[PDB]
Design a binder for this molecule. Structure first.
Ligand SMILES: [Mg+2]
Ligand SMILES: [Mg+2]
Ligand code: NA
Ligand code: NA
Ligand code: NA
Ligand code: NA
Ligand code: NA
Ligand code: NA
Lengths: 1011, 204
């Protein structure tokens, strides 16, 4: 029948979808969500054999275990065990586009498991098996007998095993197909794996059972009163003595309880559902649920007899919250939301796509600690535990159907095809039937990148029909089609329009007011965090706050999809597309996260935390205006800590308790501040600290911060008169300056400071020369390849202009002696094939104080691509342990991504000045620095810089970070100016005009001396 | 202007004059100006200017130099934005080219006198025997900033001796969204803290 090549057959003998069941036989246990004897786990060691195609599987395998098979762990992806290679492809399907057919060489995983079943389970009731996740299709045999078939890799497939099992030992045989017609609906930008990668369990239910139940909560005008409505459905034999009791608990305190026999109200001319019943419970002053305060209640559903005998119990956590769109705004419990969200794939560096509680909790904590309050299930229903955690920890979830047909041409070829409506409907309907009781889920999504087809409109309507409690969104077809209640574009920019044909990406501000538009706009994806990114992040947030209908978005995305491989000596390294022999592939585009695969933060995470703060501040005189962006909670676990410092020197600090109501304000006046001892700039820094621990944070957690320049006192006092005078020594080849223990050497042919001495030690490995380029960032590269060059990408424009091959032509080099110093003057012209790209004019003034003032003035041809930077560099001879500086820090920061950094005195080990992006590039920069100290060297001025053991050349020539090798000495890069990193997207120039080096003529000055 | 430094150095083919001033008021240093004047054997005077503006003082109306030339010519020839008066936040209509106008046209007769006649993006200015080169903004007329500031009606203005010249490295926006509250957009307020600009003065 080749059921895996027919979208008309997505399952065989599969049981209906429903909310999480456990069939407790004790109510108290259901109330506490404790383990159930009726819900067993079959996770653990299984038998597994790999085959190249289903036709290669031996018939003996159904009856008897294969001796060639290995014992492996389940759940898991067999690619992670190395049976075959995992594939990373973005848009292009991993298989030939020829729906509904798949390759004949279809990797087949044969899993089997011998397990016990107690006679008590077979003597009464129904025993079903549940597969939470099987990629991508599979057939099922129990004791040699065929049971059923299933598709859709991201939702549970359940079958009734009652007629197949026997008391004692039993053997399951599961044949998993890597590819199937269902693969055409699973073209998400991520690794292509397969296997039984989610929990497998055994559930026993009484013959007469609770087959389904829906929990709803509607409120009155001010939410002071609510009604919990619970529709319960049963299967089995109807009897008058049967009853359904639904009780609601708030902790240990029972809040309400209701009981009733089956028999619903009249529905139509044929009557009503005799097998259903709706219980309604009133609740006064309910504790509302929100990401701010995740108050949860427990709903216990009991199926029993009128005499009081319990037959079975189910239950769920209930969160009293209302989600509705009104007058253009998405409201939660009547208040307009501000989505601080992120897209999150289920990815583990070692386990692939198998999730575990530990990892889920770790992601959630990091998210809430960094001011995220929402997550989007990109792009499929998640592991069931994920919704439980979000309910409890408090995160707004967008539940997304497992539907993506990005590779099709056009994108909606399948979604507009009625013969694919069935397969699509199951992926949407079975998702709703499974998660509709989770309060964390506030929005349903019809899928991702599948264009806009009629099937979308149909399913969009189906949801609005079955579940009115949640809005429905979908981005395909233009982000604003008839299949979405929310304008949810991906990578739409703040002010810049991208008028693509048929599916343009308008600036979000303009989008809201297009003629006739009135819906709220929340980007389903924005701020592509690939590599050194998130430049311009602060621009979205400024907009979200000013525009009521710009209600935020979900950053793309949470964690890099890098995998772990081992080298020749067992050393692990982060691998990406193509590193497994997988081809065609999309290399590093699988790494777009705010954190590395191991959950170690990327520098951009801190920018997100800052911009996403819940407290806004304003300064006026000595009064700080604190404004809360919370919608429901008072600042009951926050205190404001202020600190005034002069050029890094702490001059005064204090603490004030924060007592601000949601959306309210608090005025805090600072004490009379004492005038600073010397000259310099006074800086004010405030921080919001949570004194007490929470479920998601430790005591002392900093949730927000801000800075302001206070009084500045310009130094107007001339330094002491030098004692000695620098001596100049002109020679055919050099201009040497001597001053005590110091020696400066300027090569007259190159016109560069080729060397410096402090006593007997040389200070340079490579001369100090100008630099106008940088090792290409992922955003500089885009989709350009050696095979497919993108002339539009920044990297290509620089290469094409000769920026990386520019050779300096010495125009002038003269030496002059002053009354108290030696003045060296140079002028270089960088040219490429007769084109003068840049002209550098400098003057070095070495005085008796032993200081070398470097004054630089650059000219950049208006018709050459704006340069990546304008500074100097050199390979210092020394290698120190610490790096001390006065500027923006402590973490890496760039022009368009430095709002999170603060100005102060920072001190870090040299290694922290290097950001280990898997794909190497220019990194570690720190802007707005007035003083830098390394070893015996000190540079002063107003510049940005990066210092490490890796030269820009090595960084741009190396593909993986583990292949880098510390160079001799330390490479220093001091820039007077540096281009922005961009990041609105990573496949087209995204550096905003204000952050491009286009002034034409640049000036900057540095002073080098001993610390 | 409090003088902090004024030195002279004889070079291989020129004389270098270095100065440093600090403008104060009530013991507060508003701005600091550092310059060097380089005069070579060609008779050209290269002026390098680097200013510091206290971050806590209101952003200055402009950053440049001014003086009253003894000269009084009839024409003003320049290579920059023109031919009409243009300011940083109102120069889109101006075009870059070689303009040549009568001195009076370098003056805008606003009934209520104020700073006027400026021209931006100028790389070369020619007046009488003088020529200034660089990348500056400028206005030139027979009325001083002081007279314009103290005179209520344009008909009460009297032509001063010689010609008043204002060469700006940077000039604040004029604004206009309204005329009863600060309206100069942030990007047009001189708030960088440190400014640099250079000029070359010569004859012919
Ligand atoms: Mg099928
Ligand atoms: Mg895609
Ligand atoms: Na697990
Ligand atoms: Na908003
Ligand atoms: Na990607
Ligand atoms: Na508090
Ligand atoms: Na590279
Ligand atoms: Na006046």
């Amino acid at each position: 029948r080749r059921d895996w090549e027919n979208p008309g057959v997505t399952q065989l003998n599969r049981l209906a979808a429903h909310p999480p069941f456990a069939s407790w036989r004790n109510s108290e246990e259901a109330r506490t969500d404790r383990p159930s004897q009726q819900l067993r786990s079959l996770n653990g060691e299984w038998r597994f054999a790999w085959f190249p195609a289903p036709e290669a599987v031996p018939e003996s395998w159904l009856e008897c275990d294969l001796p060639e098979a290995d014992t492996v762990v389940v759940p898991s992806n067999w690619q992670m065990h190395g049976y075959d290679a995992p594939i990373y492809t973005n848009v292009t399907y991993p298989i030939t586009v020829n729906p509904p057919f798949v390759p004949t060489e279809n990797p087949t995983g044969c899993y089997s498991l011998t397990f016990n079943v107690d006679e008590s389970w077979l003597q009464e009731g129904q025993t079903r098996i549940i597969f939470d996740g099987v990629n991508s299709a599979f057939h099922l045999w129990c004791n040699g007998r065929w049971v059923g078939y299933g598709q859709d890799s991201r939702l549970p497939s359940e079958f009734d095993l009652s007629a197949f099992l026997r008391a004692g030992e039993n053997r399951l045989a599961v044949m998993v197909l890597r590819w199937s017609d269902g693969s055409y609906l699973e073209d998400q930008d991520m690794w292509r794996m397969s296997g039984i990668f989610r929990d497998v369990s055994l559930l026993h239910k009484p013959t007469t059972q609770i087959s389904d139940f829906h929990v709803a909560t509607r409120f009155n005008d001010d939410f002071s009163r609510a009604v919990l409505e619970a529709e319960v459905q049963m299967c089995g034999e109807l009897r008058d003595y049967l009853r359904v009791t639904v009780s609601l608990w708030q902790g240990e305190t029972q809040v309400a309880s209701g009981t009733a026999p089956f028999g619903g109200e009249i529905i139509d001319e044929r009557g009503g559902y005799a097998d259903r019943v709706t219980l309604r419970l009133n609740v006064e002053n309910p504790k509302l649920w929100s990401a701010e305060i995740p108050n949860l209640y427990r709903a216990v559903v009991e199926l029993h007899t009128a005499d009081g005998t319990l037959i079975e119990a189910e239950a769920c956590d209930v969160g009293f919250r209302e989600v509705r769109i009104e007058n253009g705004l998405l409201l939660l419990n009547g208040k307009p939301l501000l989505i601080r969200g992120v897209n999150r794939h289920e990815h583990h560096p070692l386990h692939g796509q198998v999730m575990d509680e530990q990892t889920m909790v770790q992601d959630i904590l990091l998210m809430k600690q960094n001011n995220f309050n929402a997550v989007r299930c990109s792009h499929y229903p998640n592991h069931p535990l994920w919704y439980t955690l979000c309910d409890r920890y408090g995160l707004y979830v967008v539940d997304e159907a497992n539907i993506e047909t990005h590779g099709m041409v056009p994108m909606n070829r399948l979604t507009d095809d009625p013969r694919w409506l069935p397969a699509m409907s199951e992926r949407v309907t079975r998702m709703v039937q499974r998660d509709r009781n989770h309060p964390s889920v506030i929005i349903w999504s019809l899928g991702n990148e599948s264009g806009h087809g009629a099937n979308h409109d149909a399913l969009y309507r189906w949801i609005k029909s079955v579940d009115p409690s949640r809005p429905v969104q979908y981005e395909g077809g233009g982000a604003d089609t008839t299949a979405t209640d929310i304008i949810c574009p991906m990578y739409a920019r703040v002010d810049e329009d991208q008028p693509f044909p048929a599916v343009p990406k308008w600036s979000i501000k303009k989008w809201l007011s297009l003629p006739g538009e009135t819906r709220p706009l929340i980007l389903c994806e924005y701020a592509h965090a690939m590599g050194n990114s998130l430049g311009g992040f602060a621009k979205y947030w400024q907009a979200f706050r000013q525009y009521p209908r710009l209600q935020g978005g979900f950053v793309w995305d949470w964690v890099d999809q890098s995998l772990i491989k081992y080298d020749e000596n067992g050393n692990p390294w982060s691998a990406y597309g193509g590193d497994f022999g997988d081809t065609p592939n999309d290399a590093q585009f699988c790494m777009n996260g705010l954190v590395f695969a191991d959950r170690t933060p990327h520098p951009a995470l801190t920018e997100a935390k800052h911009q996403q703060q819940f407290f806004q501040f304003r300064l006026s005189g000595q009064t700080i205006e604190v404004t809360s962006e919370y919608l429901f909670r008072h600042s009951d676990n926050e205190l404001l800590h202020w600190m005034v410092a002069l050029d890094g020197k702490p001059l005064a600090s204090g603490e004030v308790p924060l007592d601000v109501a949601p959306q309210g304000k608090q005025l805090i006046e600072l004490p009379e501040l004492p005038q600073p001892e010397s000259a310099g700039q006074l800086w004010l820094t405030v921080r919001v600290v949570q004194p007490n621990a929470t479920a998601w944070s430790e005591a002392g957690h900093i949730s927000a911060w801000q800075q302001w320049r206070l009084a500045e006192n310009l130094s107007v006092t001339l330094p002491a008169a030098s004692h000695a005078i620098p001596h100049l020594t002109t020679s055919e080849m050099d201009f040497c300056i001597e001053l005590g223990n110091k020696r400066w050497q300027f090569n007259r042919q190159s016109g560069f400071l080729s060397q410096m001495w402090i006593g007997d030690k040389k200070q340079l490995l490579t001369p100090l020369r100008d630099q106008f380029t940088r090792a290409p960032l992922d955003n500089d590269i885009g989709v350009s390849e050696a095979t497919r060059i993108d002339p539009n990408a920044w990297v290509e424009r620089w290469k094409a202009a000769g920026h990386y091959q520019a050779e300096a032509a010495l125009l002038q080099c003269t030496a002059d002696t002053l009354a108290d110093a030696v003045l060296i003057t140079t002028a270089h012209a960088w040219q490429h094939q007769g084109k003068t790209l840049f002209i550098s004019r400098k003057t070095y003034r070495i005085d008796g104080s032993g200081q070398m003032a470097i004054t630089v003035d650059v000219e950049v041809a208006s018709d050459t691509p704006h340069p990546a930077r304008i500074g100097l560099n050199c390979q210092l001879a020394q290698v120190a342990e610490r790096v001390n500086w006065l500027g923006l820090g402590p973490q890496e920061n760039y022009p368009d991504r430095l709002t999170a950094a603060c100005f102060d005195r920072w001190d870090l080990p040299l290694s922290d000045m290097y950001t280990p992006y898997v794909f190497p590039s220019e990194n570690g920069l720190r802007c707005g620095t007035r003083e830098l100290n390394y070893g015996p060297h000190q540079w002063r001025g107003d510049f940005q810089f990066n210092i490490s053991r890796y030269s820009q050349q090595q960084l741009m020539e190396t593909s993986h970070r583990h292949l880098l090798h510390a160079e001799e000495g330390t490479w220093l890069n001091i820039d007077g100016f540096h281009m922005g990193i961009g990041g609105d997207d990573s496949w087209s120039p995204s550096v905003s005009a204000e952050f491009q080096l286009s002034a034409g003529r640049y000036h900057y000055q540095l002073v080098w001396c001993q610390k």
